[PDB]
Design a protein around this ligand. Structure first.
Ligand SMILES: [Ca+2]
Length: 223
């Protein structure tokens, strides 16, 4: 997260860190035993870390649980990032509490102009590199598709939306991928891609979760 702020410990209790010896992506807890993240985060050896603030210090509120199964969307296209979404089932149910909490899936989609909260432990610099150890947060509005496409020349699908600030300075970044975009109390986006971070006319691209709620619900029900 670039141009954001320190969330404050466990203030985003649905935020997870995916760890394969180190933090490599974010994710969102959607019930006690399932996390949703981005397909492009897919790898073997995933341990889900819940209740994290400082990802380099055991602070007392963590739960580490290994993934038992990962399910990349059937239609994930790594070339275009279309359908950039993945479900991870935990080996055991997390014990839910105020610092480890699920976030509601949307029943309807969000619209241009709505403010969202984006969070993660990704890069905080627009040029160069600095990785924070505590969770960072950013408030950003959903942009209209046409305004985003016109400004950025990005090639995006109806399964994606743009959020952020065309002037630059505030954006998600490398290492935030897979993490939550929450708008009006619902998980509407997953940090998916962009070009650089926080550059003028290059806003963040986010997987449009509302297009996948049928798939998420049926998949969890069957597994
Ligand atoms: Ca920790």
């Amino acid at each position: 997260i670039v141009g954001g702020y320190t969330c404050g410990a466990n203030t985003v209790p649905y935020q997870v860190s995916l760890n394969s010896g180190y933090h490599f992506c974010g994710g969102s807890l959607i019930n006690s035993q399932w996390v949703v993240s981005a397909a492009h985060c897919y790898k073997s050896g995933i341990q889900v870390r819940l209740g994290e603030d400082n990802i380099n210090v055991v602070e007392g509120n963590e739960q580490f649980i290994s993934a038992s199964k990962s399910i990349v969307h059937p239609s994930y296209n790594s070339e275009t990032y279309n359908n950039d979404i993945m479900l991870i089932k935990l080996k055991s149910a997390a014990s839910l509490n105020s610092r480890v909490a699920s976030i509601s899936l949307p029943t309807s989609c969000a619209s241009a102009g709505t403010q969202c909260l984006i969070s993660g432990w990704g890069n905080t610099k627009s040029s160069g590199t600095s990785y924070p150890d505590v969770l960072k947060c950013l408030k950003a509005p959903i942009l209209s598709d046409s305004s985003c496409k016109s400004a950025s020349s990005f090639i995006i699908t109806s399964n994606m939306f743009c959020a952020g600030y065309l002037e630059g300075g505030k954006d998600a970044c490398q290492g935030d991928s897979g993490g939550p975009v929450v708008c009006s109390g619902k998980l509407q986006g997953i940090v998916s891609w962009g070009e650089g971070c926080a550059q003028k006319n290059k806003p963040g691209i986010y997987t449009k979760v509302c297009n996948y709620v049928s798939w998420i619900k049926q998949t969890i029900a069957s597994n």
